[PDB]
Amino acid sequence: MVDAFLGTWKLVDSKNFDDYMKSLGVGFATRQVASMTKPTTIIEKNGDILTLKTHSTFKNTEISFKLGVEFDETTADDRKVKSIVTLDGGKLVHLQKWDGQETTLVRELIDGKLILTLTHGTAVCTRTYEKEA
């Protein structure tokens, strides 16, 4: 089920991330730095617990979760959210809820690349990651 997502991934393309960040209320200076950062995302499993690390020169995060079980999360931009990650149509779908707002972080594999689609409000960002050996 989740196995093809596992490993270490590097950002190689980003579209509309500033629009996504601005929709979330991220301040201009953080957006500026974020627009020039290329994170590494590491996805690992131990039994049915997944751990997703996002590492960069700017912010680092780490979450652990069971698919289909809600968890508390504090995002890179400091939102305290209620989250769930599931597998839907072969895509790893991460839904965050806070203050009646929602955002989705959808990951799918296309030609071996990991495409992350971020949606909040009307903003839709697509970020492409490529697998590291």
Binding residues for octadecanoate: 127-129
Q: Which residues of 45-55 are buried (b: 16+ CB within 10 A; e: fewer)?
A: eeeeebebbbe
Q: How many residues bind ligand MYR (CB under 6 A)?
A: 17
Q: In Å, how far from its chain's centre is CA 58? A: 15
- Candidates 64, 115, 114, 59; CA nearest to 85 is 64
User: According to the binding rule CB under 6 A, does residue 116 interact with ligand MYR?
Assistant: yes
Q: Which of 42, 76, 81, 95 binds ligand MYR (CB under 6 A)?
A: 76
CA angle 53-105-35, nearest 5°? 70
Q: What residues are paired with 85 via a beta bridge?
A: 94
Question: Residues at the annotated binding site for hexadecanoate?
Answer: 127-129
Identify which range of 1-9, 35-43, 66-74, 85-93 contacts ligand MYR by CB under 6 A. 35-43
Least Å from the CB of residue 83 to ligand MYR: 12
Q: Which of 12, 32, 57, 58 binds ligand MYR (CB under 6 A)?
A: 58
- DSSP reduced 3-state for 37: coil
User: According to the binding rule CB under 6 A, does residue 30 interact with ligand MYR?
Assistant: yes
- DSSP reduced 3-state for 29: helix
Q: Which of 10, 53, 59, 91 binds ligand MYR (CB under 6 A)?
A: 59
Q: Which residues bind ligand MYR (CB under 6 A)?
A: 11, 21, 26, 30, 34, 37, 39, 41, 54, 56, 58-59, 75-77, 116, 127
